Design a protein around this ligand. Structure first.
Ligand SMILES: CC(C)[C@H](N)C(=O)OCCOCn1cnc2c(=O)[nH]c(N)nc21
Ligand SMILES: CC(C)[C@H](N)C(=O)OCCOCn1cnc2c(=O)[nH]c(N)nc21
Ligand SMILES: [Zn+2]
Ligand SMILES: [Zn+2]
Lengths: 442, 442
């Protein structure tokens, strides 16, 4: 056994949005798997079965708790250099003014190295143990990202972006053939590295930047290598209308992807704000997933995803930060913003209720893992799963949270857990484990 | 002279939402006033006029800047103990379930001391140099808050809350006569202490907790002592309708206050989400102000204040955190949420545009100071004003912000300033000055 921990564990299950396991014992194997999880009353029994001494057990402080690692289902690693600025002009203006020039710089491998090192370190330290990254159109810089994530021990999908259409910034695109060849090369080189927890993902940027021909070939590569696919869908009203006019023969945005083999049981689509009920039924039937990106949706004045309607349709859904469209790199920010979007829908009388903080906590961990096809391996504390987890200390040095005796003995349930979700930050994250290995501190 | 600083200063003016003054020299007197502000080319001249040596000048790091202190126009100091929890059930449910029991504990002076010490230290360290506090109905605990704020050197209005109606938690109220006598005592004792920058403010909680009789007498006390008034107005639809049914003889919520001498040129009202155009004209004509509390308005599913409409009506407006209805104690959070509310109005097509980050920055500093009647003394860097300011270091130890060479030499304007406003936190606030005195570090 690599670790045995005693203390409080907080996670989600499909039948319980937030389950708090107090004074429990958890064991993690050498291979990084959770091998037991039981009440501490079972110490003697476990110590015999698993051959360990009581002195080998790490006891958490009385006010600390473990929770599962946060899962970021959509982030543009390549836009991190300007995250927290701009976020004003509209989205085609924006893409042209900020985004495409920033991504064009990734033709320089040394620039790539600086930005990607910073983004992987920053998200890990904020407790993002699994990330689904968009990189750039450049195969070699996108391979460097994969190598960086492996070095740091973060779990990740890395996607070389494809685009053969780009009218507003023509310096930043590939020919159709180039896009196909470079994707084939990216995937082969990724498979050659054989990284234990970093895999390639097929990434048409979106339907407006990829021809039918390209889309269809990317779909074939995904099928033949059995890979995940990631793209954007129905993020704003102008995009919805642009697609309608560039692809008039398709019934809706969803059909454009579906008929081109881009909507599979291993597909995740960012945004989804303007998907209709009919389109959600198609997501459900195909096993495709949505990455809810609430900060970006408000920051860029895009729209509101109706998460309650998505859940009613039994569509798989996780949370994403959508850096740099969303200005925050934090999944704690994404959780807060998700609660707020659901409240917006209640205020506007679209829905009759809002999402609870606990339901959103489940989206950020188990929901996200399900959205990326990883919920057999991660997302909560179940025997069999990889130990992807973060040790939270609400009383850490310089903590942004003020705890009072009432938070432990008063009349508000999960008071401390809720204050961490609403007020905490990286100062409260003392340790981060991915695959049972301690990755933070670095 | 107490200080002379050389470097970058960022502030608002009425004609410019964000003015960046690079390599400037600023002098602060012994009395805490700004005595000069000029380009550093004037060093020799100023050194002679004001009798100081070049070695006496404090040079800011090349990546640091001063900005004015943040002004929190509305916060319930007494609810800080449960901030970051709860925030789920509706507002009368909430008031009954969480708020009134928490405020009832302030009958214990030792409890008051702990909560109020923590809140004043926390807001100061987050750069809130001026705060307009609601305390509790207890005169002695509310006087302790005033004393605490004085000890720490924060500028503040402190308001003993009045309520003689409380059907849902009758243990927490005063009789009408008691309310009047205790307000008179609070004000007298505040004036006896003679604090240099902490003043009393008359505080009927809101029309639903104060009888006509009470409201009218509070209005007389304000008039006769020439005091500010603070209350809540038109925060949610149910409140609007409750007022209509408890005060059927008044034309609208605004009239209830106005006809009872509670709407004056020294009045600030929190929320205002459901004020009509006619009511805003009355605010404008009386000189009364609004405290925009966007985090609380979304957190409690209340509504959206249309800030563009408020500005179009030339109504005075600042920002507030509304702890604990809003879960964050940070004015940086309030700035971010304000931008987001204006974007909500653009997405819903109520407005044709949103507020810029710069306009919201102006609300958080100069707008707020104007809302509290203090814009002759604070809110920006102008000769004559008190030096209320915060030194920002975006590269501080453990900074949440990653700076890149491009933020200083690229094509995005005020990149660094914007990253601090969107991503910064208390780690970026190195020093806080109120009245020219350094109050942080403590
Ligand atoms: C007129 C329309 C075509 C509209 N202005 C438009 O082009 O929408 C673009 C955004 O669609 C998805 N998308 C593609 N790349 C990105 C991207 O990099 N970030 C985000 N948030 N969305 C993206
Ligand atoms: C049915 C209605 C009367 C409705 N449920 C209601 O009572 O609204 C109450 C909120 O009005 C203003 N208010 C009074 N005290 C507070 C308070 O402590 N926090 C906030 N955010 N608002 C407050
Ligand atoms: Zn995106
Ligand atoms: Zn309030």
């Amino acid at each position: 056994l690599a670790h045995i921990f005693r203390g409080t564990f907080v996670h989600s299950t499909w039948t319980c949005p937030m389950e708090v396991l107090r004074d429990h014992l958890l064991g993690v194997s050498d291979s990084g798997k959770i091998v037991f999880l039981e009440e501490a009353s079972q110490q003697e029994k476990l110590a015999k079965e698993w051959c360990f001494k009581p002195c080998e057990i790490r006891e958490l402080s009385h006010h600390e708790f473990f929770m599962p690692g946060l899962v970021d289902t959509h982030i543009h690693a390549s836009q991190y250099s300007f995250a927290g600025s701009s976020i004003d002009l509209p989205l085609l203006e924006w893409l042209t003014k900020y985004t495409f020039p920033a991504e064009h710089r990734f033709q320089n491998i040394d620039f790539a190295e600086e930005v990607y090192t910073r983004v992987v370190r920053r998200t890990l330290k904020n407790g993002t143990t699994t990330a689904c990254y968009f990189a750039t159109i450049h195969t070699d810089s996108s391979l460097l990202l994969a190598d960086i994530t492996d070095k740091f021990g973060q779990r990740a999908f890395v996607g070389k972006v494809c685009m053969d259409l780009n009218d507003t910034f023509p310096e930043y695109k590939e020919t159709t053939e180039e896009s196909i060849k470079e994707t084939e090369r990216f995937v082969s080189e990724m498979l050659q590295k054989n990284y234990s927890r970093v895999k390639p993902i097929v990434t048409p940027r979106f339907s407006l930047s990829c021809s039918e021909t390209l889309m269809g070939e990317l779909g074939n590569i995904a099928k033949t290598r059995d890979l995940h696919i990631q793209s954007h869908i129905s993020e704003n009203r102008d995009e919805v209308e642009a697609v309608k006019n560039l692809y008039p023969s398709y019934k809706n945005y969803t059909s454009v992807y579906d008929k081109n083999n881009l909507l599979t049981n291993k597909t995740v689509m960012a945004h989804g704000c303007y998907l209709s009920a009919e389109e959600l039924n198609v997501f459900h039937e195909r096993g495709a997933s949505i990455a809810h990106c609430p900060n970006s949706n408000l920051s860029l004045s895009s729209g509101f995803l109706n998460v309650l309607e998505v859940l009613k349709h039994e569509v798989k859904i996780g949370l994403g930060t959508d850096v740099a469209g969303g200005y925050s790199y934090s999944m704690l920010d994404a959780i807060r913003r998700a609660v707020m979007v659901s409240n917006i829908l209640l205020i506007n009388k679209v829905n009759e209720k809002s999402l609870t903080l606990k339901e959103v906590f489940r989206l950020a961990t188990l929901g996200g893992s399900q959205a990326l096809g990883l919920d057999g391996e991660i997302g909560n504390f179940e025997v069999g799963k990889e130990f992807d987890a973060i040790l939270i200390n609400p009383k850490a040095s310089d903590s942004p949270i003020d705890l009072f005796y009432g938070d432990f003995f008063g009349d508000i349930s999960e008071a401390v857990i809720q204050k961490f979700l609403y007020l905490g930050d990286d100062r409260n994250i003392e340790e981060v484990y991915v695959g049972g290995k301690q990755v933070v501190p670095f």
